[PDB]
Amino acid sequence: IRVVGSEFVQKYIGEGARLVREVFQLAKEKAPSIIFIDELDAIAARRTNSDTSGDREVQRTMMQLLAELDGFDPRGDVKVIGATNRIDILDPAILRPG
Amino acid sequence: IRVVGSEFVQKYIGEGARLVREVFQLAKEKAPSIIFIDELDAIAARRTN
Amino acid sequence: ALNQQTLAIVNVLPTSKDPMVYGFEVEEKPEVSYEDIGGLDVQIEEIRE
């Protein structure tokens, strides 16, 4: 699974939700898989609450992301792999052990 | 309710306090409530004058 | 729930029944126990106090 997290958030706010829920559903059926998500630097740091166009979109898409990732893997079925350029600039959210 | 101590302080500041305010509210609404607040040495430091 | 032609509340949907929460992680009733680290038995008794 190849998708970029720059595409996760998209123009005019609340575009959108479907990409976040589809990636994980899609994975569960294609399993064994092997979802790569893929670089997170502005989509899974922290937010202001809120400057409202930026901040809301980014917060929403994070909440939707974390719930799904938590729920299909206590055990393997779909293994999750990923990558990041820097874990310095990103704030705890996915750096939580859940 | 979890506060990670790494989200504490910037180099000019205000969000660090804001999330303290936030969890304080979440705690009152959901009484009784326990706020685990790790890690108390990045928000506390010596007294000076 | 409203009727949109007249803009009036006709019927009322349940209170809550909406996921997603602010100030995560938020966990009502963990099932994680105090036995998960043993041999620090007298320290569980003190935080209980």
Curated annotation (Swiss-Prot), chain C:
Record's subcellular location: Cytoplasm
Domain of life the protein comes from: Archaea
Signal peptide: none
Family that this chain belongs to: Belongs to the AAA ATPase family.
Entry comment, domain topic: Consists of three main regions, an N-terminal coiled-coil domain that may assist in substrate recognition, an interdomain involved in PAN hexamerization, and a C-terminal ATPase domain of the AAA type.
Quaternary state and interactors: Homohexamer. The hexameric complex has a two-ring architecture resembling a top hat that caps the 20S proteasome core at one or both ends. Upon ATP-binding, the C-terminus of PAN interacts with the alpha-rings of the proteasome core by binding to the intersubunit pockets.
Functional note: ATPase which is responsible for recognizing, binding, unfolding and translocation of substrate proteins into the archaeal 20S proteasome core particle. Is essential for opening the gate of the 20S proteasome via an interaction with its C-terminus, thereby allowing substrate entry and access to the site of proteolysis. Thus, the C-termini of the proteasomal ATPase function like a 'key in a lock' to induce gate opening and therefore regulate proteolysis.
This protein's name: Proteasome-activating nucleotidase
Gene encoding the protein: pan
Range of the intact protein held here: 107 to 155 of 398
